[PDB]
Scaffold this active site. Sequence first.
Site, PDB file in Angstrom:
ATOM      1  N   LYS A   1      65.864 -14.126  77.834  1.00  0.00           N
ATOM      2  CA  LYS A   1      66.553 -13.074  76.623  1.00  0.00           C
ATOM      3  C   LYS A   1      67.009 -14.433  75.639  1.00  0.00           C
ATOM      4  O   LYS A   1      67.533 -15.194  75.971  1.00  0.00           O
ATOM      5  CB  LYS A   1      67.814 -12.230  76.974  1.00  0.00           C
ATOM      6  CG  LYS A   1      68.284 -11.706  75.835  1.00  0.00           C
ATOM      7  CD  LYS A   1      69.415 -10.886  76.307  1.00  0.00           C
ATOM      8  CE  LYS A   1      70.114  -9.834  75.332  1.00  0.00           C
ATOM      9  NZ  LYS A   1      71.263  -9.022  75.899  1.00  0.00           N
TER      10      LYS A   1
ATOM     11  N   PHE B   1      76.018  -4.560  71.422  1.00  0.00           N
ATOM     12  CA  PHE B   1      76.582  -5.445  70.664  1.00  0.00           C
ATOM     13  C   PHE B   1      75.521  -5.814  69.559  1.00  0.00           C
ATOM     14  O   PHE B   1      74.279  -6.171  69.574  1.00  0.00           O
ATOM     15  CB  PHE B   1      76.461  -6.727  71.496  1.00  0.00           C
ATOM     16  CG  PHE B   1      77.493  -8.058  71.106  1.00  0.00           C
ATOM     17  CD1 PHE B   1      76.683  -8.831  69.897  1.00  0.00           C
ATOM     18  CD2 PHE B   1      78.529  -8.111  71.079  1.00  0.00           C
ATOM     19  CE1 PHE B   1      77.670  -9.743  69.405  1.00  0.00           C
ATOM     20  CE2 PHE B   1      79.556  -8.884  70.451  1.00  0.00           C
ATOM     21  CZ  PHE B   1      79.029  -9.789  69.423  1.00  0.00           C
ATOM     22  N   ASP B   2      76.293  -5.520  68.237  1.00  0.00           N
ATOM     23  CA  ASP B   2      75.224  -5.855  67.126  1.00  0.00           C
ATOM     24  C   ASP B   2      75.188  -7.190  66.592  1.00  0.00           C
ATOM     25  O   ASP B   2      74.309  -7.574  66.056  1.00  0.00           O
ATOM     26  CB  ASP B   2      75.867  -4.680  66.121  1.00  0.00           C
ATOM     27  CG  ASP B   2      74.776  -4.354  65.152  1.00  0.00           C
ATOM     28  OD1 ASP B   2      73.688  -3.624  65.070  1.00  0.00           O
ATOM     29  OD2 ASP B   2      74.780  -4.716  63.768  1.00  0.00           O
TER      30      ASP B   2
END
Length: 124
Positions: free
Chosen positions: A41, A120-121
């Site tokens: 990721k 989570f932005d």
Amino acid sequence: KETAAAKFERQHMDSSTSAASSSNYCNQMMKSRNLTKDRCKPVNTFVHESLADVQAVCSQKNVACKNGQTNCYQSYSTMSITDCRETGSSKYPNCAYKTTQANKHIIVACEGNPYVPVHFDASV
Ligand SMILES: [Cu+2]
Ligand SMILES: [Cu+2]
């Protein structure tokens, strides 16, 4: 396997430490939280605050999400976070990350009943 809320906790919550415990924090956390199992990721943020404090953000500043939706909320105050960003040399299976400790406002996407942070932005 898990719920959307519990997944947010797995990917973004680390209430056991007030901050990153070493420059190798991201390398350790990204692995233990199963974020490098299929691929590395690229970016991920961990929050070093109590769950209650992060959940309270759903009742704070309503703002638009990166995707255009408006179920995002920004914290009034800053929080201790650790930005984990994959290094330029990183190559799956050997995922490597740069650990960056900071204090910023977080923006999370809230869903359900109870209305809790699920995505989570960003951190600002
Ligand atoms: Cu503020
Ligand atoms: Cu969602």
